[PDB]
Amino acid sequence: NDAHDLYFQIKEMSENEKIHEKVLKAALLNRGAESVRRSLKLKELAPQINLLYKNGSIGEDYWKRFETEVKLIELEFKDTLQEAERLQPGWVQLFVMVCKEICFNQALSRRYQSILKRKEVCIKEWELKINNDGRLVN
Amino acid sequence: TNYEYDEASETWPSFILTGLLMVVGPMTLLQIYQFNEEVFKNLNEEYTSDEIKQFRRKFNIIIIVGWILVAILLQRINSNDAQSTSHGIALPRFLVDGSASPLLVVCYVALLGLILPYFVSRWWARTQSYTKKGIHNVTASNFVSNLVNYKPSEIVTTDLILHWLSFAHEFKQFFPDLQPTDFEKLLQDHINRRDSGKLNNAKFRIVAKCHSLLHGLLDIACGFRNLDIALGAINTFKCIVQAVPLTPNCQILQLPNVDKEHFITKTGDIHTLGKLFTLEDAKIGEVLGIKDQAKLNETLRVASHIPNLKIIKADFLVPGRPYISLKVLVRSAKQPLIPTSLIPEENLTEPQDSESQRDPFAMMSKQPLVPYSFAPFFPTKRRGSWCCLVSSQKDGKILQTPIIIEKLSYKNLNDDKDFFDKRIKMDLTKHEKFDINDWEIGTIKIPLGQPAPETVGDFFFRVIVKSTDYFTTDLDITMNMKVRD
Amino acid sequence: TLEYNANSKLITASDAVVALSTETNIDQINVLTTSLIGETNPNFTPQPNEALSKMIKGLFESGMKNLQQKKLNEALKNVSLAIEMAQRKRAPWEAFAIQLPELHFMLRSKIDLCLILGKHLEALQDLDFLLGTGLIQPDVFVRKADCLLKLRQWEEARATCERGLALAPEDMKLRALLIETARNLAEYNG
Amino acid sequence: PFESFLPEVIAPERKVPYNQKLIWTGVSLLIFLILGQIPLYGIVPLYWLRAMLASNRGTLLELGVSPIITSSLIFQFLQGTQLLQIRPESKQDRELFQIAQKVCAIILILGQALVVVMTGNYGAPLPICLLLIFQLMFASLIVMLLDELLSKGYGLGSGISLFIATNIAEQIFWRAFAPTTVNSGRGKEFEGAVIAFFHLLAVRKDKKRALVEAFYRTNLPNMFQVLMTVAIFLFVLYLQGFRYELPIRSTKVRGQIGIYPIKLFYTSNTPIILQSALTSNIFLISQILFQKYPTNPLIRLIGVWGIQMALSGLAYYIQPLMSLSEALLDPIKTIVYITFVLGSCAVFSKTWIEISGTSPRDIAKQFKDQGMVINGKRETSIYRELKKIIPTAAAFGGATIGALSVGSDLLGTLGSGASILLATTTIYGYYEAAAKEGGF
Amino acid sequence: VEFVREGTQFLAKCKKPDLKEYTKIVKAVGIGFIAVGIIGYAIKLIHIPIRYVIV
Amino acid sequence: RVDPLVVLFLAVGFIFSVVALHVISKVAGKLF
């Protein structure tokens, strides 16, 4: 459940099949967006995890795994930024902002795209009989 | 000093006799010194299937022997015939000097080296692995890892919660060969009231164990301040304990003997208990399609005994820690609506004493327990419950752990006041047998768990009290705090 | 595995069965690549586009003009096409606080038009998305409660009306909606 | 301030439930108790110090808890002199304080072990001596680890108190149900109380003949003393419930009504132990000086030893009463002993409640800091009211403890009032802590 | 003579425990005390014959 | 750093070693 190794796979395929130069930048922007999303999620979720841990209903080793992930994510982000600097000279002061925008933008995009499937679950669970034109025929 | 053991067996009988007397006597003295009507305790065991019965069936002499030993030892004593100090011990001679000498020391080596550390380590591992709630740690880790990366886009249904439950670790120790897919399929065949074919003794086990797992999931979801998952958890618990799929008109399919192929096809407007009771006695049988009086009485007696709630008065209370108070009226699905104005207002008020002000929950702790539920397909026997959870109305998040109340007086349901019916419609409030002082009104106290905000204004709340065993009618109200200072 | 197209420069997975996460990520990478192909500047700036906004507004106004003409059917198609184009041909790295409010404003008009026309489930789903994406106002709860009461769901209707009254208690329509819901529910049981 | 890397037990990150704590306490107690009964390998005084230090000679536990207790007392003294000037605002300072405690305790263990092996009665003649030193070293190290384990949070409370209570209870049961026998002319007579009573009931079978002999037993423990000790145990348990409660209310956060209790045994453990230590040290130094010096004016005046007991001296008056006979013999000695022990216990309770930082002024300052106030009293009178209760309560508790000790020593129970009182106080503290916490 | 008077006043102002809690107190304390003492006695006893056999 | 079961294991091993040394030194004198 990650978008990390896919970028390396695309890089290895580029190393032999002579793909264009923009696909690498695309995959890199995607990896950056995913990293920022995970960073924000963990930052805003830390206090509730800590409360549940102090309450004594989550265990012990999960807290250590979480604390390790906190800094592993930052290390991954730093590696991505270094790769971005390597790919294009003097191209870091724009990368963070472009990533901070694409994160929220594609988040909204997915949230909106989910409705085409979400629409029929209610149909099935409430046993409606809907004809065409979105009207109700009971 | 240096002792010399007893070699003629002259003293150890008295020692053993007094050692036995001191332990026996007080035990004999101790042995010498040594609310809610339930109408389902009979009809539950009558409709449960036979395989479930066989499953649920499948999965002081010390005093007398001590007295006989006392007798034989006393006889052995009475049969016997018998300056510097000479020390002597009471234990016999053969225990330390004969050929059984290394036996004692090797038994001691064993009991000290191989029994104590092994047992202590095993017990410590067992008690350390388990989480405080009562579930394994791998299961809690999986629940949290699944709730973390959970897209808000996917709507929570029953199948999703079943898919989550199929990954529990406690299901693996029971059957180290099976896979989570088999567990999902078993639970699906249970919910759809289908036969597993060969794995019935596994389906019953996992269904019996599902309870604590769902409790843990509910608690964790309430911890993450997420309401949809907790509500879905309560609904899935209902569906599993009652063995019925979640549909619009389910409260009328949970009844003992109804045929779906008749009800769904014929009627389409009867949706819950009240609309059903609106009809007469013969029309009920004609609609349900059972046409059997001896069995119609049973299904009506079950359909007139599942508890519906109703609010009377709800407001804040401000001690050092705020705690909410509720006044509910546990009623059956048959009594018509009684107005709140007829309440004598005596029951609703609380006595103000020092002991009551110290711990107000003491009065709640006095109410009786609830009867055994009506679970024709849940393997074990379950007691009714009521899980109450509170959230905010400005954003829509759970703000505390859910409180699980268990004690409630179901007195208003008994077969004594059967005259008070809805189909009579002649204003039975002005009846000779109507006594407003007989109907008892339970009480529920919910601590707010969070301090009041330091601002001044109105802040709305929302408390829900859902059932956990039936498909009855529950509460969903909005109350606001008027912080004024 | 994954194959790289020759001329279209699109990545497609040649596997037979794949999970959903990989499909979402590959689609996102395709979108990003197709948009970077169009954006020829090496150092792209988060500044939004102009001609795209112009054509979007043109489509929106051409759909809006059907209301004055009392043409209620084609306006829905026009607004839907405008939203679809603004969703597809607007690059993801563009500004957030300019792509969000335009979408919200167009979606509100679409909701009103769809509810007036006679389509209910689509309107309810749109209102739910609009309420979940971070905009809470008493001009939304009324229409959502209306949709629920129209398509015969009572418990959520009462809950929604109560949440709506829990923010602007001085309203005059929410109380009527709450009264109607209470009566209909007393009929639903009694 | 220094750096160190030493073994230590880690504290639990979450609160431990009651059952695990009880089981760990039981297992640690069983291990400590077994450790004290096994003899050394290379092997070929005052009972008061060995009883109060909870140690016995000739076994792996020869040093006992003496190094731990002396290290704790030394660091208490260093904190009392305000020389370490510890600041509660720093936790690293407290960690350094504890690590210094441990590193000086281990050094004292090593020094005491070397001393006792070099001068002890084991003998001057080398690998055997090395092994004999290593045995005591490892044993006392394990005892220190067990104490620190029980103190970190896995145990119900302190460890030294528990070990002392265990030895006291064991001696009390052994003076009652002893299996040993002593054959002195007449025959075998058990060294236990209940055992000998049942034996004389069985073998002799003469009720009026055997009961009168088993009831007095002027030479060996009998049933009368067991009844007296169970009665005084019940009485001491009864006297713990006496407590004064004053009503208090908060001013910072309203709606907070509470009650502050004030017991009678305010500082029960301190005066009895201090008085016992005083008497033991006086007796020891008097014995030493009378053994070294044959006769001197001051030596004869302060104490003369005879049959061994002190007589015709100042050390003679401090000697406790044996029974009613000596009580009726010399009334002046009994009277002076009673008034001396009562005055000493009272002044000890007073000075200890003054030095411990629990004076009415200190508790009034703590109240003013917390903001609590009496329900029916003003603010500027809290200290004046506490002056009228706290010192009187402390003095009265000391006096009644001393009177109970005198009564126990006189009525002839199986154990002195000091030991039984210490055990009861410790167990009562454990029980009240478990109750106020809330658990089975 | 004022000291015993103040002591009597104080004890009259204290709260004596009644039977319903005195019984629980004596139960807990006696149970703990006997549970410690029996362990002490058994461990002191069993180790005599072993100390003879081994040594 | 140190777990409680480790302390228990050390104590038990210590007691067992002392008992074993005693019994071996005794059987050495008994046999020879």
Query: How many CB atoms are located within 10 Å of the residue B132 CB?
Result: 14
Chains C and F physically touch (3 or more Cβ atom pairs below 8 Å): no
Range of the domain at A102: 1-138
Q: H or E stretch including D374?
A: strand D372-374
Q: What gap in Å lies between CA A57 and CA A77, rounded to an integer?
A: 31
SS (H, E, C) chain B: CCCCCCCCCCCHHHHHHHHHHHHHHHHHHHHHHCCCCCCHHHHHHHHCCHHHHHHHHHCCHHHHHHHHHHHHHHHHHHHCCCCCCEEECCCCCHHHHCCCHHHHHHHHHHHHHHHHHHHHHHHHHHHHHCCCCCCCHHHHHHHHHHHHCCCCCCCCCHHHHHHHHCCCCHHHHHCCCCCHHHHHHHHHHHHCCCCCCCCHHHHHHHHHHHHHHHHHHHHHHHHCCCHHHHHHHHHHHHHHHHCCCCCCCCCCCCCCCCCHHHHHHHCCCCCCHHHHHCCCHHHHHHHHCCCCHHHHHHHHHHHCCCCECCEEEEECCCCCCCEEEEEECCECCCCCCCCCCCCCCCCCCCCCCHHHHHCCHHHHCCCCCCCECCCCCCCCCCECCEEEEEEECCCCCECCCCEEECCCCCHHHCCCCCCCCCCCCCCHHHCCCCCCCCCCCCEEEEECCCCCCCCCEEEEEEEEEEECCCCCCCEEEEEEEEECC
Query: Do chain E and chain C touch with ≥3 beta carbon pairs under 8 Å?
Result: no
H-helix or E-strand containing A89?
Answer: none
List chains touching D (3+ CB pairs under 8 A). Answer: A, B, E, F
Distance CA(D115)–CA(D368), nearest Å, equals 52
Pick the residue from chain E with its C-alpha nearest to D167.
E40
Q: Would you state the structure tokens that stand for residue C33, as one six-digit string?
A: 């690549």
Amino acid at D263: K
Quote the number of domains for chain E. 1
Tell me how close the Cα of A83 comes to any Cα of chain B, in angstroms.
27
Using DSSP, state whether D262 is helix, strand or coil: strand
Q: Do D182 and B88 touch (CB under 8 A)?
A: yes
What order of strands is seen across the sheet that includes strand B311-315? Answer: B311-315, B323-328, B443-447
Residue A123 DSSP symbol:
H
B16 touches chain E (CB under 8 A): no
Token pair 């549940």: residue: A52
CA atoms within 13 A on the CB side of D39: 15
Q: Which run of H or of E encompasses D58?
A: none
The CA distance from B292 to B197, in Å, is 31
> 3-state DSSP call for residue D36?
coil
User: Could you tell me where the DSSP H helices lie in D306-416?
Assistant: 314-317, 324-329, 331-355, 360-370, 382-387, 390-411
Residue B260 lies in a domain: no
Is the CB of residue D229 less than 8 Å from the CB of residue D405? Answer: no
**Strand, coil or helix: what is D87?**
coil
D433: containing domain: 18-176+227-437
Do residues B26 and B355 lie in contact, with contact meaning Cβ atoms separated by under 8 Å? no
Contact D226, D194 (CB under 8 A): yes
DSSP C47: P
Sheet with B386-392, strands from edge to edge, namely: B403-405, B386-392, B457-467, B475-483
* CB B2, CB B88: distance < 8 Å: no
Contact B201, B55 (CB under 8 A): yes
Q: What is the rounded distance in angstroms from the CA atom of residue B251 to the CA atom of residue B472?
A: 7
Identify the bridge partners of residue B314 per DSSP, sorted by sequence position.
Answer: B326
Q: What is the DSSP letter of D320?
A: P
- CA angle C123/C127/C129 to nearest 5° reads 120
| Phi, psi values for residue B288, rounded to 5° | -65, -25
CA atoms within 13 A on the CB side of D341: 26
Provide the number of structural domains found in chain D: 1
Instruction: Name the token pair of F11.
Output: 């104590």
Determine contact: B150 vs chain A, CB below 8 A.
no
The pairing of strands D309-311 and C3-4 is: unpaired
CA neighbours closer than 13 Å in the CB half-sphere of residue D10: 8
How far from the centroid of its chain's Cα atoms is residue B359's Cα?
24
Sequence letter at residue D100:
A
Rounded to an integer, what distance in angstroms lies between the CA atom of residue D346 and that of residue D353? 11
| Enclosing H/E stretch for D323 | none
C-beta separation of B396 from B227 below 8 A = yes
Contact indicator for E25, D431 with CB cutoff of 8 Å: yes
Q: What end-to-end distance do the CA atoms of chain D give, in Å?
A: 44
For tokens 């059956």, the residue is B332
3-state helix, strand, coil in chain F (%, to 5): 90, 5, 10
| One-letter amino acid for residue B395 of the chain | D
Q: If you measure CA to CA, which chain A residue comes closest to D16? A: A56
Adjacency order of strands within the sheet including D243-250: D257-263, D243-250, D372-374
> Dihedrals φ, ψ of F18, to 5°?
-65, -45
CA distance B92 to B12: 7
Q: By C-alpha distance, which of C149, C139, C78 is closest to C112?
A: C139
User: Could you tell me whether strands D257-263 and D243-250 are parallel, antiparallel, or unpaired per DSSP bridges?
Assistant: antiparallel
**Contact (CB, 8 A) for C127 and C148:** no
The residues, ordered by sequence, that sit 6+ positions from A98 with a Cβ below 8 Å of its Cβ are: A29, C44, C46, C93
Q: Is B381 within 8 Å of B372 (Cβ atoms)?
A: yes
Neighboring chain E residues of B102 at a CB cutoff of 8 Å: 53
Contact C166, B478 (CB under 8 A): yes
Is there an interface between B and F (3+ Cβ pairs < 8 A)?
Answer: yes
D312/B250 Cα distance (integer angstroms)? 100
Establish if D257 belongs to a structural domain: yes
Instruction: Give me A21's structure tokens.
Output: 């130069």
Are residues D36 and D62 in contact, defined by beta-carbon separation less than 8 angstroms? no
CATH number at residue B210: 1.10.3380.10
Task: Give the amino acid at D330.
Answer: D
Verify whether the Cβ–Cβ distance F19 to B109 is below 8 Å: yes
Identify the CA nearest to B247 among candidates D8, C56, A20, A126: A126
**Tokens 């996460």, located at residue:** C21
**Distance from the A59 Cα atom to the nearest Cα atom in chain D, whole angstroms:** 10
| DSSP symbol at A132 | G
| Euclidean distance between CA atoms D8 and D105, whole angstroms | 14
Measured between alpha carbons, how far is D408 from D421 in angstroms, rounded to an integer?
A: 10
Positive or negative CA dihedral for B417, B423, B429, B433?
A: negative
DSSP D321: P
Q: Which domain holds residue B223?
A: 137-246
Alpha-carbon span D250 to D374, nearest angstrom? 9
Cα-trace Rg, chain E: 22
Amino acid type, B198: K
Reading the block at residue D19, the tokens are 């059952």
Q: Please give the span between the terminal C-alpha atoms of chain A, in angstroms, as a whole number.
A: 42
Q: With beta carbons less than 8 A apart as the criterion, state whether A128 and C127 touch.
A: no
d(CA B73, CA B76): 5
- Backbone angles phi and psi of B16, in degrees to 5: -65, -35
Q: Does B396 touch chain C (CB under 8 A)?
A: yes
Longest dimension (CA), chain B: 110
Q: Phi, psi at residue B328, to the nearest 5°? A: -110, 155
Cα(D203)–Cα(D210) distance, integer angstroms = 10
Considering only CB atoms, F7 lies closest to which of D38, D41, D146, namely D146
Which residue, among D322, D318, D321, has the nearest Cα to D341 in the 3D structure?
A: D318
For residue A60, list chain D residues with Cβ-Cβ distance below 8 A.
Answer: 13
Distance CA B363, CA B160 (A): 41
Q: How many residues does chain A have?
A: 138
Write D359-366 long-range contacts (CB < 8 A, 24+).
D359/D390, D360/D386, D360/D387, D360/D389, D360/D390, D360/D391, D361/D386, D363/D390
Q: Is the four-CA dihedral D372, D376, D379, D383 of positive or negative sign?
A: negative
Task: Please answer yes or no on whether C28 and A136 come within 8 Å at the CB atom.
Answer: no
Method of determination? cryo-EM
Report d(CA C157, CA C136) in Å as an integer. Answer: 17
Look up residue D244 and give its DSSP letter: E
The identity of residue B39, as a single letter, is V
Check CB contact under 8 Å for C36 and A6. Answer: no
Amino acid at residue number B269: D
Q: Strand, helix or coil at D377?
A: coil
Question: What residue has token string 């209760």?
Answer: D389
Q: Is B480 on the interface with C (CB under 8 A)?
A: yes
Terminal-to-terminal C-alpha distance of chain F: 46
With b for 16 or more beta-carbon neighbours within 10 A and e for fewer, the B31-49 pattern comes to eeeeeeeebbeebbeeebe
- Rounded to whole angstroms, what are the CA distances from B245 to B161, B212, B241? 13, 21, 11
Beta strands in chain C (DSSP E): 3-4, 11-12
Measured CA to CA, the distance from residue A80 to residue A37 in angstroms comes to 14
How many residues would you count in chain C? Answer: 190
CATH number, domain with residue B478: 2.60.40.150
- B365 lies in some domain: yes
Residues D10, D16, D19, D23: what is their CA dihedral angle, to the nearest 10 degrees?
Answer: 10
Backbone angles phi, psi at B462, to 5 degrees: -155, 115
| Chains contacting B (3 or more CB pairs within 8 Å) | A, C, D, E, F
In the chain, the amino acid numbered A52 is L
d(CA B137, CA B149): 19
Count of domains for chain B: 2
Mutate to test the interface with C, among B270, B462, B471 (most CBs of C within 10 A): B462
- For residue B113, the distance in angstroms to the closest alpha carbon of chain F comes to 7
Spell out the residues 6+ positions from residue D267 whose beta carbon is closer than 8 angstroms to its own.
Answer: D349, D352, D353, D356, D358, D394, D397
Evaluate whether residue B188 is within a structural domain: yes
Looking at the 3D structure of chain A, how many domains does it have?
Answer: 1
If one counts the domains in chain F, the total is 1
CA D3 to chain CA centroid, nearest Å: 35
∠B171-B176-B178 over CA atoms, to 5°? 75
Nearest residue to E44 via CA among D178, D412, C109, C174: D178
E-strand spans in D186-312?
188-190, 243-250, 257-263, 304-306, 309-311
Q: Which of D351, D341, D326, D329 is nearest to D399 (CA)?
A: D341
Report phi then psi at C97, rounded to 5: -75, 5
Q: CA-CA distance, B459 to D225, in Å (whole number)? A: 71
